[PDB]
Amino acid sequence: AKEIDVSYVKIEEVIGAGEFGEVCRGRLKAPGKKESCVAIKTLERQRREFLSEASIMGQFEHPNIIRLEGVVTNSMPVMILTEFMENGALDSFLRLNDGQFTVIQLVGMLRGIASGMRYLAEMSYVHRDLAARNILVNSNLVCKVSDFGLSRFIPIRWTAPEAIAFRKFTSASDVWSYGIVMWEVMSFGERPYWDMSNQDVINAIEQDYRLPPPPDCPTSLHQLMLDCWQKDRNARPRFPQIVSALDKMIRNPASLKIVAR
Numbered sequence: 001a002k003e004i005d006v007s008y009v010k011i012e013e014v015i016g017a018g019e020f021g022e023v024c025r026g027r028l029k030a031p032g033k034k035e036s037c038v039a040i041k042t043l044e045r046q047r048r049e050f051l052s053e054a055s056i057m058g059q060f061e062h063p064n065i066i067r068l069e070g071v072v073t074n075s076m077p078v079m080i081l082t083e084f085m086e087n088g089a090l091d092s093f094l095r096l097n098d099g100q101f102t103v104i105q106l107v108g109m110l111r112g113i114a115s116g117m118r119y120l121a122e123m124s125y126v127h128r129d130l131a132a133r134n135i136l137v138n139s140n141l142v143c144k145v146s147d148f149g150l151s152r153f154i155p156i157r158w159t160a161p162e163a164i165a166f167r168k169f170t171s172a173s174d175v176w177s178y179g180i181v182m183w184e185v186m187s188f189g190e191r192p193y194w195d196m197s198n199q200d201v202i203n204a205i206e207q208d209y210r211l212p213p214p215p216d217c218p219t220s221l222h223q224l225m226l227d228c229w230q231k232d233r234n235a236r237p238r239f240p241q242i243v244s245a246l247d248k249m250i251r252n253p254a255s256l257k258i259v260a261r
């Protein structure tokens with residue numbers, strides 16, 4: 001929770017809205033450091049809920065987790081600052097780039113997301129809302145796991161079946177969500193389960209249906225999705241094994257040439 005002096009922070013265009021107010025694009029100019037772009041949540045009662053998020057974010061330091069720049073608490077407005085990700089959310093970025101990235105590039109995106117989740121899981125942090133809309137993409141296509149919560153610029157179709165029903169959220173339920181993210185990525189941002197209703201999705205999953213391989217998806221990647229969607233949560237791979245599986249694919253790209261009929 002590094003405190004930032006406001007004279008370094010200049011607020012520009014509004015990019016969306018949050019639970020506690022606006023979210024804006026901005027610039028950060030600190031002594032001795034270059035000027036960079038930042039995204040800023042602004043904020044009123046004495047509720048410390050707004051800043052409690054910053055206390056959570058400050059624990060995280062990883063190349064695939066959104067990086068908190070700092071906070072302003074001795075000023076108005078009160079603000080949470082992170083690095084600014086030029087390509088925005090992954091789902092809309094991929095829809096804008098439909099069919100325009102190679103399989104190897106998509107796998108590299110997924111490997112980054114998996115590494116970020118591996119870190120969170122190692123930290124005993126359960127995300128609970130992992131979805132492509134919660135991943136930000138930088139100019140080099142590095143994907144960073146984020147959590148926008150209640151935001152704008154209830155999601156059961158990313159949630160493991162045991163978390164929907166029993167409200168049992170674990171890293172293994174995040175693994176389920178990660179498999180959905182894999183499908184979103186290999187589908188260039190198609191909505192999981194198309195236009196099915198939330199109830200239809202729950203019923204389909206309970207009947208053991210699983211999203212099919214996206215067009216051109218390597219069979220080995222869809223199998224990895226199916227592994228993440230095992231009903232028995234203890235049978236799903238853990239994030240370390242997921243990273244290792246993707247790394248094996250990057251080393252052996254001939255394995256990614258096998259697609260289904």
Ligand SMILES: Cc1ccc(C(=O)Nc2cccc(C(F)(F)F)c2)cc1Nc1nc(-c2cccnc2)nc2c1cnn2C
Nearest residue numbers: 016023039040041082083084085088145146147148151152
């Ligand atoms: C400004 C901000 C504030 C919070 C978070 C965030 O991800 N917090 C969070 C909380 C709990 C757990 C985790 C996790 F575990 F996932 F790491 C993260 C990210 C951003 N940064 C941005 N927010 C928005 C944004 C936009 C609209 C509504 N809400 C947020 N747009 C952005 C950025 C950076 N670049 N861009 C384009």
